[PDB]
Ligand binder design. Structure first.
Ligand SMILES: Cc1c2c(n3c1CCCN(C)C(=O)[C@H](C)Nc1cc-3ccc1C(N)=O)CC(C)(C)CC2=O
Length: 207
């Protein structure tokens, strides 16, 4: 297991997300589904030039999986996935400028729900999750587990769990007072409200 420090701007963003009073937390789901949709767009596009990129799985979909016993909500996709370099360096570098602009927009009157316009919507996970685990598999790289409970650090390790083929699973370990997001009615409501037209099947598992 390797431990890394977040870029300072990203630690800053995470603290703002965790500490700011903001009741409209449900937008986290739209942001994660959007990340998945983007990842699915990417593998779909690449497979047009090289169909063998789908040897790791032809189905392009999104699954939402609540687990009350574990108090987790998992967003699973069969998108392009992420390499080790993506997880440690590349995406965080990109996130830096997005974070700076977002925090500036907030100072100017924007609100947290606009986070996705700055490319850092992933971090809205921390509106509802005390810990986030990202298990990911990209073609031509290994399966990795990224994890962070905030506090300025994240870990990356090779994942020994069930092989995924290709794609990403974002496991939200929910805060004690955020269990409404494990309820079927509540998730259905949020998907209908904010993610109605996503161009891939979204299956809401039940318990
Ligand atoms: C930015 C950013 C970040 C993450 N994603 C994106 C968003 C960057 C744009 N984007 C969607 C991608 O680069 C790839 C393809 N897919 C994903 C990225 C992210 C989340 C989910 C997916 C996912 N579900 O595949 C996750 C990590 C852990 C690297 C932290 C972070 O800064």
């Amino acid at each position: 297991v390797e431990t890394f420090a977040f870029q300072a701007e990203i630690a800053q963003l995470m603290s703002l997300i965790i500490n700011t009073f903001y009741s409209n937390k449900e937008i986290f789901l739209r942001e994660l589904i959007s990340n998945s949709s983007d990842a699915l767009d990417k593998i779909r596009y690449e497979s047009l030039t090289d169909p063998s990129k789908l040897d790791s799985g032809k189905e392009l979909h999104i699954n939402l999986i609540p687990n009350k016993q574990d108090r987790t909500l998992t967003i699973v996709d069969t998108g392009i996935g992420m390499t080790k370099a993506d997880l440690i360096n590349n995406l965080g570098t990109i996130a830096k400028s997005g974070t700076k602009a977002f925090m500036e927009a907030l100072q100017a009157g924007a609100d947290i729900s606009m986070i996705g316009q700055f490319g850092v919507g992933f971090y809205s996970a921390y509106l509802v999750a005390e810990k986030v685990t990202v298990i990911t598999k990209h073609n031509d790289d290994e399966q990795y587990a990224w994890e962070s409970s905030a506090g300025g650090s994240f870990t990356v390790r090779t994942d020994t769990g069930e092989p995924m083929g290709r794609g990403t699973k974002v496991i939200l370990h929910l805060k004690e007072d955020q269990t409404e997001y494990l309820e079927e009615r509540r998730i259905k409501e949020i998907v209908k409200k904010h993610s109605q037209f996503i161009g891939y099947p979204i299956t809401l598992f039940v318990e």
